[PDB]
Structure formats: structure tokens, C-alpha cells
Design a protein around this nucleic acid. Structure first.
Ligand SMILES: [Mg+2]
Ligand SMILES: [Mg+2]
Ligand SMILES: [Mg+2]
Ligand SMILES: [Mg+2]
Ligand SMILES: [Mg+2]
Ligand SMILES: [Mg+2]
Ligand SMILES: [Mg+2]
Ligand SMILES: [Mg+2]
Ligand SMILES: [Mg+2]
Ligand SMILES: [Mg+2]
Ligand SMILES: [Mg+2]
Ligand SMILES: [Mg+2]
Ligand SMILES: [Mg+2]
Ligand SMILES: [Mg+2]
Ligand SMILES: [Mg+2]
Ligand SMILES: [Mg+2]
Ligand SMILES: [Mg+2]
Lengths: 141, 185, 55, 76, 124
RNA sequence: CACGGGUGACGGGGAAUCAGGGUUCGAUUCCGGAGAGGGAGCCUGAGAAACGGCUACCACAUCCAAGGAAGGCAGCAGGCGCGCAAAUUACCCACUCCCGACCCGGGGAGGUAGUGACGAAAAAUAACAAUACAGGACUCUUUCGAGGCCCUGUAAUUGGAAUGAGUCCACUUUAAAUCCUUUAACGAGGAUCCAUUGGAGGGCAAGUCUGGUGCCAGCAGCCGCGGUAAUUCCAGCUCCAA
């Protein structure tokens, strides 16, 4: 506090109400532009249609070819370069399948070696990719 | 609009740091000393101790000769005396803050059976509690977390429906007796 | 290229899992943990070795 | 061919769409124990079959009723 | 070895009955039946067991105590005057009808449709 | 800070996180407001602009003989669609009360059951004894070794002793049932009646173990690991967190 009067409540409240909008988390949480730019639209999970599989080259020093899927959503129709998490699980995902798409834990931000990928795949055609990796369940054919 | 309670509360609160070595050391010593089942058994007694110490601090923040302070202090001292952790001569609201998790775990019915000595080990006493061989005031106690009152301390003994007491023998004894009589003729 | 998917997972040697006696669980597991931590060992000089320490 | 309850309805719709020109549609419903009912369909060439359990009759009968009302038309 | 004690004894002249909470001690056996409860209350209170109605047993843990409520009427006419028909049918002096509730609702909605004397002719 | 706009805003008692201060939520069982697809109007009636009341228009839709008639589940169940996202087309007015001409009838209000790992509370998956062993307070012995009044643990070594989970007659429960508790008879030595979920470079408890891969696969929330001796991948063993 800078103005320490006995009746400066409206001054302190208006100054703090003006200065809250300069915070990065407050402005992102309270403006609808980030919610419009978010493909999930304030959602934890999202189903979508596989259309192609893309080998994305990696960033600086770590150099590899990560595996991504061009997921077209149902609730919006937007396109997401979703990430196939585990080893050898690109072969389970075929063309024109419904996959469940979640975040990656940085709240809509690219993570590590992969440029321009925010989201990943959890389930594949109502069968979980974790169980497809472990070998418990089988893909329904 | 249905007729039910919807009233519940978590009896335990997890610590802020998950992998403190000294904290795991102290909790592991507590479990290995008093025969516990998990860390939740430590944490729920820690949270009841947190309740009692928070009530004690809320009383010490009050002024002396306040009627609410005197009534709540006398009631809390009566509760500590009847659970038998704090002594009947020691009872004052300033001595509540100097009380410990070990003295709270001493009043476990598992630990009290181990101290009276009718069971061999602490976990064997827990086996007896699970298998319903002991009773308290003509009432079978199946759960080892029974806080035994000081007035109800001396009534701990074996139950009536118990082969270790005055009752019918168990399934293994009946099966061995039947097998022996079948082998004899 | 996407032709090398599952390469190492395919070409590693499949080792079968060894059959093992079932572990005690719950209060008995924590009791056996307490017994292997405290009451067995003695205070020794130097740096104490870890539980999974091997040479 | 023993199928799922939804796959049975899709193949049953395909049976009528194939029999829009010529061919019979046979629907056999019977009790099944090994509460369940066996429902089978036959065009004369390709047979399909399903078993409807108690857990899905409310989901099944309404869409099956709309399927029959949309697919059967006789003389005025 | 079965022992029955009574607590909270009350005389309802406005209901023409006695009432008490029944405490049954039965070591070495299961919960004793209501017929044996009525017989032991009858030989206790020197009355006929036809008027004694006992219900609502709850067995405590351990297995040596139950708690149940029971009333002792003056006569069977007073029992049928103020006693519920379901607890009468527990023993068998009253028998309720077997007309199912959804079919009664369907019969009522069918009688609602037809106006006139034929409301009786709709049913069967 | 009027006016205007937005609200992914019904308001409150309250919920979570919490030192002291605050922040976020509140559709959600209680009180009040609004509504029955969108508005508008009205009869009856003390009380309605009522929609399980009508009267007209728009959107959606049923039968038809082509003149015509009839509809409103943001009620109980349940269905299509929408989805990351949500239960039985059950039984009963017996508990609670409500209404009627009323002690007697009705109540998808309500109660009880079916699904249910939203969540909260308690809490099985072993314990004891005997052998060998590995050790700690005593006595003895320069050490090595020895006696057990006191012990503690381990080893698919052996032994009986005790119980549920299940099975299931019988009460009890209840409107009739179900579950709990009680209770006979069965029911456990790999007590196979086998507890998993994540990790082992650091934050952060826990292998510089072994084999393969060789900046490829992949791991990694951050730093980083992998370019032919990987404490970081993939498998075995071991251990650690609950
Ligand atoms: Mg709005
Ligand atoms: Mg509200
Ligand atoms: Mg809304
Ligand atoms: Mg209204
Ligand atoms: Mg209206
Ligand atoms: Mg209404
Ligand atoms: Mg309606
Ligand atoms: Mg859900
Ligand atoms: Mg009623
Ligand atoms: Mg009535
Ligand atoms: Mg209701
Ligand atoms: Mg098990
Ligand atoms: Mg590893
Ligand atoms: Mg770490
Ligand atoms: Mg560490
Ligand atoms: Mg970097
Ligand atoms: Mg790591």
C-alpha cells in the first residue's frame, strides 16, 4: 500500500482492480481469447477422428522423430497434432478412428523436444493405449 | 429432498512434503513400536492431535476467567482424563500442548491387550481382535482402534464365544478331532 | 519416416518372468519392513550402504 | 453370425436395403437360456443373429421399432 | 436360557394396550422367534398370546442381546380396532388383496377414459 | 463510475484452500425469485396470466376417407442426439406428511430396493510354537569359543491352534423382500482363498546390477539421458512411495 488514508478503500480497490489485469495467469483466466484459442474449450478430454500420422522432427540438442496424429475434433472440428505417448503404439492407431485427446500437464504449452504439440492421446477406439501397450486388452477387429 | 445426513469429514490430513526421510523414520518407528497397519493410522491420530492442540491454542488465546474458556477447558480436561492420556492430577489447559503421539497410541486396545499380557505379540493381539476372542464389558470388540477408557480398562478379558476362553473349540480342532476319531473307528 | 516404429520393442530379447514366492502384504509387509530396517542392522563405521546397493 | 446388438441392427438395415428389389426377410424371436432372447434374421443367403439381454431391452426395442416402422410398407 | 426383560413400561388407555421395550438375552443360540417371544410374554403376563404383538428386533454385536418393541392389547377386537393390517397379516388373521399396484393404476386410467356406467364394464 | 455492454452470473445460508489476512465456487436436497419449446391473452377459482387448464401465431411432429381431429417428460423410469461427462421402462403408501365429503380412498411427493471406485468412515490378504543360523545387555576367556536365567530377526524346515471371504438350512429385518447382526453344517500351508498403482541421475524415498538397442527406438511436468561399457530407453532381478 502507498496511500494510507482512513477512507481510501475505493482508491486501493480501483488500483488493485486495474493492476490485476497485468498478471499473466489472471488475464488468461479471465479473458475469453485464451478459451477461444484453446481447442478443448475448457475441457479435460476430447474425442476426435484420426486422419493422418505425421513424423515430427525434434528440436535442439535432442534429435529424433516423434510420432503425432492429425486429430480432427467433434465438438469444434479443430485440428490437433496429438502426441502418441508410448513406444511402438503408432501401429495400434489406424486411419479413421476415434481417439481420446488430453493435455500434457503444462496447461496448453509445448513441452521439451517436440515443437508445436500441446496434447496427447489416452484412449484409442474405447480401448486404452496403456492397456494396448501393456498387452492386457486387444484391439477390436 | 430426501431424508439423509450428507455429513462426513476426513479424519486424516496428508503432510505437505511426501518424502521426508526423518518423517518416514518417525512414522515407521511408531508403526513398528505400536503395531499399526499403515501411515493413515499415524496420520488420523496426528489430525485428532491437531484438533485437540488447535482447541487448546484457541482456549489459550482467550482471556482468563472467561466462562466459555473455563467450560471448554474443563470439558477438554474431562475428555483427556476419561480417555486416560492425561493424568487426573496434571489436568490444566496449559499441559495439553505438551502431549504426544506416542501417549495417544498407548491407549489403543491392541496396545492395552499387549500391556495386560493376555496376548503374546502386538500383531497377535490384533489377530485376536480380528478373530473376535476378546470382549470389553460383555461386548465383543472386533476393531483394534477402540479407545479404551480408564474406567473401562480393567474389564478387558476373553469373550465367552471363544475357544481360548470358556467356549467351544475352533474349526481346526474340531476337524482334527473328527479325523482322529475317524482314523480310530 | 515412420517405418522404424516399435523397432527396439520388437528386437529386444523376450525374457520370461521368474516364478516367485508371494509377498506378505499390509501390516505384515510393514512389520517385515520395520524388522529389516531397524532391529537387524548394527551401527557401523563409514558411509552406510543403501537398500538396493550392490557391488 | 453372432454379432453385437448395434451391429445386428445395422446389418438388419442392410438386409432391407438389399431386399428393396427381391427377397424375403425372416425374423425369428425365441427364448434363450444358453433374461435373454435370441433374435435372428435371414434373407435367404446371409444369416445374422444376436442375443438381447435384460440390460439393453429399453435401448434395443425402441430403435428396433423405428427400424421396422421405417422399413416395412405394404398396400394402402 | 432365554431371558426376557421389559423397559419403559407404559399403559395406553387411549389405545387400550400395554407397551414396553423388550430386551432378550439368549446366549448360545440364535435370535429366538416371535412366536416364542409371544409365548414367553403370555406366560409372564398371564394373558392369552393372541393379543401380544411383537415386532422390530435389532440384534446387537457379539450375539447376546436383542432389542424389540411389543404391545399387549386387551382384546382381539381392540387389536383389530387399532392395529395395522400388515402386522395383522404377519400372523394371519387379516389377508390383503393381491391386486398389483401398476395394474390398478392402469385400470383407473382405463376407467378414466370411458364416461358412464361402462366404467365397470371396462374392467374384465 | 450513471448510462451501455459482457457474464462459461438465479441470490443467500454455505463449500474448498487455509497462520493472521484473503482467493475461488455455489445448478445441486433449506428460504425466496423465474419457467414448463418461443412469446401473448383469458375462463374458473380466495389464491394462475396456471400449461399433467384453455385461446391464437412461429418452430417440431401423429392419424386421415383430404371434409377434419389431436400434442407438450427443465416430473418419475427410460430412449435419440450432444458429448470427457451422469443409474432401473422395479416394489409400496408400511416411515414422513399432503389432499378429499375424510379413522376407511389417492399420492413416480416420499420410502425401500437395482447400477455405482464422485466421495467419506471402519478395515481381511496372517499369527504362534519347535529346528538350524545371524546377532545384542551378563558370566567366563588375552582373543578364538562356551552356559542360558533376558532376548530379536531370517530361512518353500516342520507342526498344530484361530478365524473370515464364500457356500448355506433357520430366525431377525421389511408393506413383501434384500443387506447388516445372530446362528447350525461345510470351508486355509505355494493358507494358488497369489494386491496392485508409479518410480529408482537430481528435486524425491529408492541398483554406477545384468542383456539388447547405438542421438534410431524412445525416456523426460524442469535440468537433461540415448552418437556400441545407458546409475535416465526396452526386458529380468532387487528396492522405494501409498
Ligand atoms: Mg449471458
Ligand atoms: Mg444456488
Ligand atoms: Mg447453466
Ligand atoms: Mg409459473
Ligand atoms: Mg401458460
Ligand atoms: Mg404444475
Ligand atoms: Mg409434463
Ligand atoms: Mg461419471
Ligand atoms: Mg403412507
Ligand atoms: Mg389413506
Ligand atoms: Mg421422487
Ligand atoms: Mg487377495
Ligand atoms: Mg529400468
Ligand atoms: Mg526423481
Ligand atoms: Mg534420494
Ligand atoms: Mg534445454
Ligand atoms: Mg528419471
Amino acid at each position: 500500500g502507498k496511500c494510507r488514508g482512513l477512507r481510501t478503500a475505493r482508491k486501493l480497490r480501483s488500483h488493485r482492480r486495474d493492476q490485476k489485469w497485468h498478471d499473466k495467469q489472471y488475464k488468461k483466466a479471465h479473458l475469453g481469447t485464451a478459451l477461444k484459442a484453446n481447442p478443448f474449450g475448457g475441457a479435460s478430454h476430447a474425442k476426435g477422428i484420426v486422419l493422418e500420422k505425421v513424423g515430427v522432427e525434434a528440436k535442439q540438442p535432442n534429435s529424433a522423430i516423434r510420432k503425432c496424429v492429425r486429430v480432427q475434433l467433434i465438438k469444434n472440428g479443430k485440428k490437433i497434432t496429438a502426441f502418441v505417448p508410448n513406444d511402438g503404439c503408432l501401429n495400434f492407431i489406424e486411419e479413421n478412428d476415434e481417439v481420446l485427446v488430453a493435455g500434457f500437464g503444462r496447461k496448453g504449452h509445448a513441452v521439451g523436444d517436440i515443437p508445436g504439440v500441446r496434447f496427447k492421446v489416452v484412449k484409442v477406439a474405447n480401448v486404452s493405449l496403456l492397456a494396448l501397450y501393456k498387452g492386457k486388452k486387444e484391439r477390436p477387429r | 429432498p430426501v431424508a439423509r445426513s450428507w455429513v462426513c469429514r476426513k479424519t486424516y490430513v496428508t503432510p505437505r512434503r511426501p518424502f521426508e526421510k526423518s518423517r518416514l523414520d518417525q512414522e515407521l518407528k511408531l508403526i513398528g513400536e505400536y503395531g499399526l497397519r499403515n501411515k493413515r493410522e499415524v496420520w488420523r491420530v496426528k489430525f485428532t492431535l491437531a484438533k485437540i492442540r488447535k482447541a487448546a491454542r484457541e482456549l489459550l488465546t482467550l482471556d482468563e476467567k472467561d466462562p466459555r474458556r473455563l467450560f471448554e477447558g474443563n470439558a477438554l480436561l474431562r475428555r483427556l482424563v476419561r480417555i486416560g492420556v492425561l493424568d487426573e492430577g496434571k489436568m490444566k489447559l496449559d499441559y495439553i500442548l505438551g502431549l504426544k503421539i506416542e501417549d495417544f497410541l498407548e491407549r489403543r486396545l491392541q496396545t492395552q491387550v499387549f500391556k495386560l499380557g493376555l496376548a503374546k505379540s502386538i500383531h497377535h493381539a490384533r489377530v485376536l481382535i480380528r478373530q473376535r476372542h476378546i470382549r470389553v464389558r460383555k461386548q465383543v470388540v472386533n476393531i483394534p482402534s477402540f479407545i479404551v477408557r480408564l474406567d473401562s480398562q480393567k474389564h478387558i478379558d476373553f469373550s465367552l464365544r471363544s475357544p481360548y476362553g470358556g467356549g467351544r473349540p475352533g474349526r481346526v480342532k474340531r476337524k482334527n478331532a473328527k479325523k482322529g476319531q475317524g482314523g480310530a473307528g | 519416416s515412420l517405418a522404424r516404429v516399435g523397432k527396439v520393442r520388437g528386437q529386444t530379447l523376450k525374457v520370461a518372468k521368474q516364478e516367485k514366492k508371494k509377498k506378505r502384504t499390509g501390516r505384515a509387509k510393514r512389520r517385515m519392513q520395520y524388522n529389516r530396517r531397524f532391529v537387524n542392522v548394527v551401527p557401523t563405521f563409514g558411509k552406510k550402504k543403501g537398500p538396493n546397493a550392490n557391488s | 453370425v453372432l454379432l453385437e446388438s448395434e451391429q445386428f441392427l445395422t446389418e438388419l438395415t442392410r438386409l432391407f436395403q438389399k431386399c428393396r428389389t427381391s427377397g424375403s426377410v425372416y425374423i425369428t424371436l425365441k427364448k434363450y437360456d444358453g433374461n435373454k432372447c435370441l433374435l435372428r434374421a435371414t434373407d435367404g443367403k446371409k444369416k445374422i443373429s444376436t442375443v438381447v439381454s435384460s440390460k439393453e431391452v429399453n435401448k434395443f426395442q425402441m430403435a428396433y421399432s423405428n427400424l421396422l416402422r421405417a422399413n416395412m410398407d405394404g398396400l394402402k | 436360557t432365554v431371558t426376557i426383560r421389559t423397559r419403559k413400561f407404559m399403559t395406553n388407555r387411549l389405545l387400550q394396550r400395554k407397551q414396553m421395550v423388550i430386551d432378550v438375552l439368549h446366549p448360545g443360540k440364535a435370535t429366538v422367534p416371535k412366536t416364542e417371544i409371544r409365548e414367553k410374554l403370555a406366560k409372564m403376563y398371564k394373558t392369552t398370546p393372541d393379543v401380544i404383538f411383537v415386532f422390530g428386533f435389532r440384534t446387537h454385536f457379539g450375539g447376546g442381546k436383542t432389542t424389540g418393541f411389543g404391545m399387549i392389547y386387551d382384546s382381539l377386537d381392540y387389536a383389530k380396532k387399532n392395529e395395522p393390517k400388515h402386522r395383522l397379516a404377519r400372523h394371519g388373521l387379516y389377508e390383503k388383496k393381491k391386486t398389483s399396484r401398476k395394474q390398478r393404476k392402469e385400470r383407473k386410467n382405463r376407467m378414466k377414459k370411458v364416461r358412464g356406467t361402462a366404467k365397470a364394464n371396462v374392467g374384465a
